[PDB]
Amino acid sequence: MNPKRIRALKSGKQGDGPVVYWMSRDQRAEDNWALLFSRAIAKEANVPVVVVFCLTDEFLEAGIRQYEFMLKGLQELEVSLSRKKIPSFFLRGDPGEKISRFVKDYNAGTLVTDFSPLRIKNQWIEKVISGISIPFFEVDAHNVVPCWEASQKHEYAAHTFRPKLYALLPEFLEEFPELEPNSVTPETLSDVLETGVKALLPERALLKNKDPLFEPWHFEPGEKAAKKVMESFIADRLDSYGALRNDPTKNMLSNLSPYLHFGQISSQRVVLEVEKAESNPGSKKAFLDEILIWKEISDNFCYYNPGYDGFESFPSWAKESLNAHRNDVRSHIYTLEEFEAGKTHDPLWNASQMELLSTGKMHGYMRMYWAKKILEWSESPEKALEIAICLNDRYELDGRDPNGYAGIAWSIGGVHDRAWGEREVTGKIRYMSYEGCKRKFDVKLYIEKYSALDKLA
DNA sequence: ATCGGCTCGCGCA
DNA sequence: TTGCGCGAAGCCGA
Ligand SMILES: Cc1cc2c(cc1C)N(C[C@H](O)[C@H](O)[C@H](O)COP(=O)(O)OP(=O)(O)OC[C@H]1O[C@@H](n3cnc4c(N)ncnc43)[C@H](O)[C@@H]1O)c1[nH]c(=O)[nH]c(=O)c1N2
């Protein structure tokens, strides 16, 4: 293993007890550097490795769609891990409180966790550091190149981040070793799933006839299913990807984001498999740029800008520009609730909101348009930001993610973009138009697909 | 230093 | 639709 993937959070003397991998971002047993590091620490100390996962109350802020997807994955993971004689413990409550107590009760010798740049994880990590006396390590298992190694500062643009990342790819793009089962031999999911579903039922998104909007058959959860999705992408869609990625009437994306978000598949694995596939060099290049440069610069953004979900993290040129247009008359102003229900004047905007409500995965091209029109038809840039984050995290399966905050900040605040022609309301922020979409794809077919969904509560 | 080059709309063929 | 050249625009880094 490359040691630059590990960072020490707290030093100390190893205990005589097991190695505890506090799993949080990377919910998978294969292709997982955090779990492979924990197992190796355990092997040379001659103790078992165990996995712990803390189910927090944050699920109440999203929907059944994300909760079920994640919990069904965990049910499959629990079996996979137990097949390698690795027990998994599912705690309920505040990780700051619960992880400390678990380490004490269970007499852990060493604590390991995976890496996320979101604020709340760093808050928990500092709470855990105060509650423990054993060594504490962090492993970047989500990025190909460890986030603190790729760059030491906020990267202004993809083209400044690209060479830094590619300079390190020969070193860090490598195969994964096998997870060795435990040799030393060492609250109930289903109850948790059923209890949480009952808590969320009053907030389910429903049609007029009381049927749920959400269609759960577009993405089967879990590690096994994720691998099939990757394989059928390489086999059927990667060749057309470069030419058709921006056409929402074609189902030509990898569809991997719900699995990448929950860590049910490793993007390093996807990159390995795509690198070795014989297909169109332009498609491979377009796809590797998205899953390497744009995904990992989103961790760069959140990790070096703690206010990544706020106006104040925009570049100065964009703050100045949007400020100067704060008093311009908006052509329309919608509330959160009229956006949410798809009640704007624009049938193409409404159709993308319908795709979001019913599938939980809006086409990537439409996310740019969707977010830019929220800025255009809301009373202020801060309200636009609020509305865009709220609908993104409530309804996207891949939401509550660095990629989301960075994509919204790109769309509304020009983060990782540049300045364009000055307009009213949106200032110098890059503009997108309904007529622009019409030159690029059959807008009418996309609208027609989602039209019959004004059947809304 | 100093300038080439970055993930839209629109006219046109 | 399809590709191209152009426009308007601020700034990083060889
Ligand atoms: C306003 C807005 C809002 C969001 C996002 C972008 C924008 C403009 N995205 C990013 C992107 O739209 C999304 O990852 C893909 O549409 C996911 O679909 P596929 O995996 O099929 O894409 P596709 O197969 O094209 O891409 C493969 C992977 O590359 C990465 N990638 C692609 N486009 C990216 C982008 N613009 N930024 C960062 N990484 C990118 C993602 O990991 C994606 O899963 C996002 N993504 C996400 O994971 N969670 C979210 O909440 C959102 N929400």
XYZ file of C-alpha atoms (C1' of nucleotides) and ligand atoms in Angstrom:
537
model
C 0.000 0.000 0.000
C 1.124 3.581 -0.779
C 1.474 5.324 2.625
C 0.560 8.730 1.189
C -3.062 7.496 1.308
C -2.941 7.542 5.142
C -2.871 10.570 7.430
C -2.520 10.425 11.225
C -5.361 12.199 13.037
C -4.162 11.444 16.574
C -1.051 9.668 17.795
C -0.851 7.300 20.735
C 0.085 3.817 21.861
C -1.719 0.915 20.193
C -4.150 -0.900 22.432
C -4.201 -4.691 22.651
C -7.712 -4.757 21.162
C -9.008 -5.023 17.601
C -8.616 -2.543 14.777
C -11.868 -0.640 14.246
C -12.654 0.772 10.804
C -15.257 3.493 11.307
C -16.909 3.233 7.905
C -18.763 6.297 6.730
C -18.199 7.393 3.117
C -17.046 4.154 1.462
C -19.785 1.549 1.970
C -18.200 -1.438 0.266
C -15.979 -4.427 1.068
C -13.991 -4.568 -2.192
C -11.553 -1.955 -3.567
C -11.480 -0.063 -0.264
C -8.141 1.374 0.894
C -9.540 2.266 4.341
C -10.605 -1.339 5.009
C -7.399 -2.740 3.442
C -5.303 -0.451 5.638
C -7.289 -1.474 8.742
C -6.830 -5.168 7.911
C -3.076 -4.785 7.485
C -2.691 -2.942 10.782
C -4.638 -5.782 12.401
C -2.545 -8.484 10.697
C 0.803 -7.255 11.986
C -0.664 -6.670 15.463
C -2.359 -10.111 15.450
C -5.820 -8.761 16.264
C -9.044 -8.868 14.248
C -10.422 -6.023 12.216
C -14.048 -5.051 12.723
C -16.280 -2.538 10.958
C -18.514 0.005 12.676
C -21.060 2.272 11.004
C -23.113 4.992 12.731
C -26.665 5.652 11.514
C -27.248 9.296 12.381
C -30.444 11.336 12.368
C -29.476 13.124 9.186
C -31.613 10.653 7.181
C -34.624 12.699 8.356
C -33.401 15.516 6.090
C -33.747 13.524 2.848
C -36.291 10.917 1.753
C -37.122 7.255 1.679
C -35.467 7.133 -1.744
C -31.928 7.654 -0.328
C -32.516 5.874 2.987
C -33.742 2.646 1.379
C -30.979 2.693 -1.230
C -28.301 3.076 1.430
C -29.776 0.604 3.939
C -30.317 -2.132 1.324
C -26.680 -1.720 0.368
C -25.660 -2.065 4.011
C -27.713 -5.274 4.309
C -25.721 -6.766 1.429
C -22.441 -5.411 2.815
C -23.090 -6.961 6.227
C -23.262 -10.403 4.596
C -20.196 -9.775 2.419
C -18.110 -8.741 5.398
C -19.360 -11.593 7.547
C -18.248 -13.980 4.761
C -14.705 -12.742 5.365
C -15.274 -13.244 9.121
C -15.335 -9.467 9.635
C -18.143 -8.461 12.023
C -20.021 -5.244 11.420
C -21.604 -3.155 14.180
C -24.336 -0.654 13.371
C -24.619 2.138 15.930
C -27.446 4.627 16.215
C -26.858 8.228 17.241
C -24.182 10.939 17.245
C -20.828 9.588 15.948
C -19.044 12.052 18.214
C -20.674 10.368 21.191
C -21.154 6.838 19.897
C -17.771 6.128 18.274
C -15.895 7.173 21.437
C -18.065 4.958 23.617
C -17.757 2.021 21.224
C -13.965 2.285 21.218
C -14.025 2.191 25.020
C -16.581 -0.612 25.470
C -14.931 -2.750 22.802
C -11.334 -1.963 23.904
C -10.183 -0.949 20.411
C -6.442 -0.898 19.785
C -6.488 1.438 16.746
C -9.165 3.531 15.017
C -9.328 4.109 11.248
C -11.842 6.078 9.196
C -12.283 7.034 5.564
C -12.069 10.585 4.159
C -14.873 13.079 3.437
C -14.382 16.862 3.116
C -17.894 17.763 4.287
C -18.056 19.962 7.405
C -19.974 17.618 9.663
C -17.443 14.756 9.325
C -14.613 16.991 10.493
C -16.813 18.051 13.431
C -17.301 14.396 14.421
C -13.593 13.665 13.967
C -12.624 16.404 16.420
C -15.213 15.156 18.914
C -13.819 11.637 18.563
C -10.228 12.811 19.049
C -11.190 14.316 22.424
C -12.860 11.088 23.587
C -10.121 8.553 22.799
C -6.531 7.768 23.799
C -5.674 5.284 20.993
C -4.157 6.093 17.567
C -6.559 7.513 14.975
C -5.892 7.308 11.214
C -7.668 8.655 8.123
C -7.418 6.974 4.671
C -8.551 8.556 1.399
C -10.436 5.631 -0.134
C -12.672 7.750 -2.412
C -10.175 9.633 -4.599
C -7.615 8.018 -6.884
C -5.027 10.568 -5.720
C -5.403 11.432 -1.996
C -7.130 14.797 -1.766
C -4.386 16.425 0.389
C -1.696 15.050 -1.975
C -3.272 16.131 -5.267
C -2.976 19.815 -4.370
C -2.301 21.883 -1.264
C -4.615 24.765 -2.139
C -7.950 25.693 -3.648
C -7.613 25.041 -7.380
C -8.996 27.912 -9.440
C -9.870 25.806 -12.501
C -9.775 22.342 -13.996
C -6.880 23.373 -16.233
C -4.711 24.256 -13.259
C -5.718 21.057 -11.416
C -5.412 18.706 -14.462
C -1.564 18.608 -14.713
C -1.107 18.249 -10.973
C -3.470 15.280 -10.920
C -2.070 13.597 -14.036
C 1.472 14.025 -12.767
C 0.548 11.749 -9.829
C -1.663 9.250 -11.641
C 1.222 6.861 -12.616
C 1.976 6.506 -8.905
C -1.551 6.178 -7.467
C -3.527 4.407 -10.229
C -2.838 0.772 -9.306
C -4.679 -2.489 -8.733
C -6.147 -3.362 -5.396
C -4.917 -6.328 -3.354
C -7.403 -8.852 -2.016
C -9.066 -8.400 1.351
C -7.739 -11.218 3.538
C -10.408 -12.698 5.864
C -9.888 -12.336 9.591
C -7.734 -15.112 11.030
C -8.300 -14.132 14.659
C -11.987 -14.668 15.359
C -13.756 -11.795 17.278
C -28.594 -2.270 16.143
C -30.413 -4.678 13.740
C -30.763 -3.486 10.119
C -34.324 -4.296 8.903
C -35.634 -3.021 12.221
C -33.716 0.205 11.520
C -34.942 0.250 7.915
C -38.583 -0.276 8.928
C -38.448 2.294 11.763
C -36.826 4.940 9.575
C -39.269 4.364 6.736
C -42.179 4.856 9.123
C -40.632 8.115 10.324
C -40.275 9.391 6.730
C -43.655 8.268 5.350
C -45.501 11.579 6.085
C -42.963 13.396 3.891
C -43.010 10.964 0.922
C -43.474 12.710 -2.429
C -46.888 11.591 -3.705
C -49.120 11.838 -6.766
C -52.722 13.051 -6.703
C -53.939 9.425 -6.441
C -51.672 8.844 -3.370
C -49.115 6.747 -5.335
C -45.464 7.647 -4.627
C -43.665 9.672 -7.284
C -40.403 7.827 -6.823
C -39.704 4.911 -9.157
C -37.302 2.554 -7.319
C -36.452 0.268 -10.267
C -34.040 2.513 -12.171
C -31.069 1.686 -9.882
C -30.801 -1.502 -7.802
C -28.678 -0.807 -4.689
C -25.556 -2.579 -3.533
C -22.014 -3.595 -4.509
C -23.073 -6.451 -6.799
C -25.504 -4.257 -8.746
C -22.920 -1.433 -9.039
C -20.439 -3.749 -10.699
C -23.062 -4.825 -13.282
C -23.825 -1.162 -14.035
C -20.123 -0.450 -14.611
C -19.799 -3.512 -16.842
C -22.782 -2.658 -19.021
C -21.529 0.931 -19.302
C -18.192 -0.272 -20.671
C -19.899 -2.781 -22.957
C -22.844 -0.727 -24.298
C -22.468 2.975 -23.621
C -18.820 4.043 -23.275
C -18.252 4.077 -27.035
C -21.004 6.669 -27.602
C -20.290 8.558 -24.388
C -18.179 11.388 -25.801
C -20.679 12.210 -28.517
C -23.929 11.686 -26.557
C -23.159 12.527 -22.900
C -24.907 15.902 -23.266
C -28.122 14.627 -24.888
C -30.776 13.976 -22.208
C -32.969 12.001 -24.611
C -30.325 9.221 -24.727
C -29.562 6.940 -21.836
C -25.839 7.115 -22.471
C -24.284 8.079 -19.094
C -22.568 5.573 -16.879
C -25.410 5.823 -14.286
C -22.773 5.248 -11.613
C -23.312 8.311 -9.425
C -25.680 6.810 -6.783
C -23.127 4.034 -6.255
C -20.135 6.392 -6.276
C -21.917 8.671 -3.798
C -22.489 5.969 -1.177
C -19.145 4.372 -1.951
C -20.744 1.120 -3.168
C -18.207 1.109 -5.994
C -14.683 2.553 -6.080
C -13.967 5.105 -8.772
C -10.383 3.833 -8.882
C -11.822 0.477 -9.975
C -13.947 2.158 -12.664
C -10.895 4.067 -13.911
C -8.839 0.848 -13.999
C -11.503 -0.926 -16.072
C -12.075 2.019 -18.437
C -8.332 2.513 -18.977
C -8.025 -1.077 -20.233
C -11.168 -1.074 -22.387
C -10.625 -0.798 -26.133
C -12.981 1.902 -27.241
C -13.156 5.345 -28.802
C -10.212 7.424 -27.480
C -12.355 10.571 -27.394
C -15.030 8.871 -25.286
C -12.422 7.455 -22.874
C -10.824 10.867 -22.553
C -14.171 12.607 -21.983
C -15.203 10.001 -19.377
C -11.864 9.951 -17.504
C -11.919 13.752 -17.292
C -15.320 13.637 -15.602
C -14.613 10.896 -13.084
C -11.031 11.985 -12.340
C -10.695 15.771 -12.807
C -14.230 16.977 -12.097
C -15.049 14.525 -9.293
C -11.752 15.034 -7.436
C -11.684 18.794 -7.858
C -15.054 18.747 -6.097
C -13.302 17.260 -3.032
C -10.579 19.886 -3.522
C -13.248 22.581 -3.380
C -15.050 21.431 -0.260
C -11.826 20.538 1.534
C -10.197 23.946 1.089
C -13.372 26.124 1.251
C -15.382 25.375 4.433
C -18.144 27.698 3.261
C -18.620 25.624 0.062
C -22.424 25.887 0.287
C -22.524 29.671 0.591
C -22.258 32.785 -1.534
C -19.020 33.809 0.178
C -17.082 30.933 -1.494
C -17.701 32.353 -5.001
C -14.773 34.050 -6.802
C -14.578 37.839 -6.292
C -15.425 38.625 -9.910
C -18.696 36.687 -9.574
C -19.629 38.143 -6.174
C -19.063 41.672 -7.488
C -21.085 40.894 -10.605
C -24.043 39.271 -8.835
C -24.069 42.000 -6.159
C -24.325 44.738 -8.806
C -27.427 43.037 -10.242
C -29.259 42.448 -6.929
C -31.817 45.189 -7.652
C -32.593 44.195 -11.267
C -36.213 43.290 -11.979
C -36.641 39.533 -12.261
C -38.727 38.376 -15.191
C -40.295 35.765 -12.900
C -39.926 34.980 -9.214
C -40.826 31.502 -7.956
C -40.837 30.180 -4.417
C -39.224 26.964 -3.257
C -42.610 25.249 -3.449
C -43.422 26.240 -7.038
C -39.980 25.120 -8.230
C -40.381 21.898 -6.259
C -43.729 21.086 -7.913
C -42.583 22.059 -11.413
C -44.893 25.082 -11.720
C -42.661 27.464 -13.703
C -43.528 28.977 -17.106
C -40.793 26.840 -18.760
C -41.791 23.285 -19.805
C -38.191 22.221 -20.207
C -37.334 23.313 -16.667
C -40.494 21.605 -15.396
C -39.619 18.342 -17.195
C -36.185 18.211 -15.572
C -37.798 18.714 -12.162
C -40.146 15.843 -13.030
C -37.158 13.666 -13.944
C -35.658 14.519 -10.542
C -38.857 13.772 -8.590
C -39.610 10.459 -10.273
C -36.145 8.956 -10.930
C -33.875 10.577 -8.341
C -31.216 11.256 -10.988
C -31.496 14.284 -13.236
C -29.506 14.086 -16.475
C -26.128 15.810 -16.048
C -26.624 18.349 -18.814
C -30.035 19.352 -17.416
C -28.568 19.958 -13.936
C -26.631 22.944 -15.333
C -29.766 24.413 -16.955
C -31.923 23.586 -13.920
C -29.639 25.421 -11.501
C -29.027 28.463 -13.729
C -32.772 29.065 -14.151
C -33.215 28.940 -10.355
C -30.741 31.840 -10.152
C -32.635 33.641 -12.923
C -36.122 33.338 -11.378
C -35.511 33.828 -7.636
C -35.476 37.004 -5.561
C -31.746 36.883 -4.711
C -28.593 34.805 -5.276
C -28.662 33.534 -1.666
C -32.246 32.321 -2.111
C -31.277 30.661 -5.407
C -28.421 28.857 -3.658
C -30.748 27.777 -0.838
C -33.411 26.459 -3.196
C -30.956 24.652 -5.464
C -29.184 22.907 -2.550
C -32.473 22.017 -0.871
C -33.988 20.346 -3.969
C -30.674 18.700 -4.970
C -30.170 17.095 -1.546
C -33.827 16.186 -0.959
C -34.367 14.426 -4.291
C -31.067 13.295 -5.954
C -29.889 9.796 -5.064
C -26.320 11.091 -5.504
C -27.010 14.241 -3.472
C -25.484 15.568 -0.230
C -22.169 15.262 -2.025
C -19.107 17.408 -2.738
C -19.962 17.019 -6.434
C -23.340 18.624 -5.772
C -22.045 21.659 -3.864
C -19.344 22.175 -6.512
C -21.757 21.782 -9.435
C -24.277 24.165 -7.912
C -21.436 26.617 -7.167
C -20.254 26.291 -10.755
C -23.759 26.979 -12.097
C -24.766 29.811 -9.790
C -21.438 31.261 -8.680
C -18.957 30.608 -11.457
C -16.707 28.454 -9.264
C -14.224 26.729 -11.625
C -15.724 28.702 -14.524
C -14.916 32.082 -16.066
C -16.832 35.294 -16.760
C -19.107 35.760 -19.784
C -21.139 38.549 -21.341
C -22.834 40.739 -18.775
C -26.616 40.287 -18.509
C -29.262 41.618 -16.166
C -29.985 39.537 -13.039
C -27.256 36.953 -13.708
C -24.432 39.448 -14.409
C -21.352 37.756 -15.871
C -22.337 34.215 -14.830
C -22.404 31.868 -17.829
C -25.880 31.831 -19.388
C -27.904 28.932 -20.886
C -31.109 29.275 -22.878
C -34.060 27.189 -23.988
C -33.210 27.963 -27.623
C -29.631 26.803 -27.009
C -30.874 23.396 -25.867
C -33.033 23.120 -29.026
C -29.988 23.377 -31.295
C -28.299 20.611 -29.304
C -31.001 17.975 -28.729
C -34.639 17.093 -29.316
C -36.063 19.134 -26.426
C -39.625 18.117 -27.324
C -38.900 14.426 -26.760
C -37.479 15.129 -23.287
C -40.518 17.209 -22.406
C -42.849 14.522 -23.751
C -41.214 11.812 -21.625
C -42.106 13.579 -18.365
C -45.204 15.553 -19.424
C -47.940 13.395 -17.866
C -46.698 14.214 -14.355
C -48.743 17.337 -13.599
C -50.687 14.720 -11.592
C -48.983 16.248 -8.551
C -50.192 16.510 -4.922
C 7.020 38.953 -17.908
C 3.364 38.654 -20.724
C 0.125 36.363 -23.034
C -2.487 31.884 -24.407
C -6.330 29.589 -23.083
C -10.182 28.180 -20.326
C -16.452 22.098 -19.372
C -22.073 29.288 -23.268
C -25.145 31.872 -27.433
C -25.618 32.897 -32.164
C -24.938 33.365 -37.450
C -24.012 30.690 -40.994
C -23.456 26.936 -44.517
C -29.740 19.101 -35.740
C -23.985 19.580 -37.091
C -19.267 22.037 -36.960
C -16.988 26.429 -37.040
C -15.601 30.951 -36.031
C -16.656 34.624 -33.200
C -18.035 37.232 -29.094
C -17.404 38.958 -24.062
C -14.866 38.272 -20.400
C -11.278 37.672 -15.709
C -7.334 35.454 -14.345
C -3.672 31.714 -13.521
C 0.786 30.349 -14.583
C 4.579 29.011 -17.660
C -26.195 21.785 -10.464
C -25.483 20.455 -10.398
C -25.835 19.537 -9.411
C -25.194 18.306 -9.331
C -24.182 17.985 -10.247
C -23.826 18.899 -11.235
C -24.474 20.129 -11.324
C -24.208 21.011 -12.521
N -23.533 16.737 -10.130
C -22.530 16.315 -11.125
C -22.996 15.477 -12.315
O -24.130 16.070 -12.938
C -23.405 14.080 -11.845
O -22.350 13.470 -11.114
C -23.735 13.130 -12.997
O -24.840 13.656 -13.739
C -24.019 11.741 -12.460
O -24.503 10.906 -13.533
P -23.547 9.762 -14.107
O -22.724 9.160 -13.020
O -24.393 8.869 -14.934
O -22.590 10.682 -15.004
P -21.331 10.384 -15.945
O -21.374 8.947 -16.324
O -21.367 11.408 -17.016
O -20.084 10.718 -15.025
C -19.316 9.748 -14.279
C -18.982 10.371 -12.941
O -18.133 11.525 -13.146
C -18.352 12.475 -12.115
N -18.764 13.735 -12.718
C -19.454 13.919 -13.885
N -19.851 15.158 -14.081
C -19.384 15.834 -12.968
C -19.526 17.173 -12.535
N -20.098 18.141 -13.272
N -19.005 17.504 -11.329
C -18.378 16.558 -10.619
N -18.177 15.269 -10.932
C -18.707 14.969 -12.114
C -19.430 11.893 -11.197
O -18.790 11.166 -10.154
C -20.150 10.941 -12.146
O -20.839 9.969 -11.369
C -23.730 15.968 -8.985
N -22.930 14.892 -8.850
C -23.072 14.145 -7.740
O -22.424 13.080 -7.560
N -24.003 14.529 -6.780
C -24.851 15.630 -6.878
O -25.587 15.956 -5.950
C -24.710 16.347 -8.081
N -25.557 17.381 -8.351
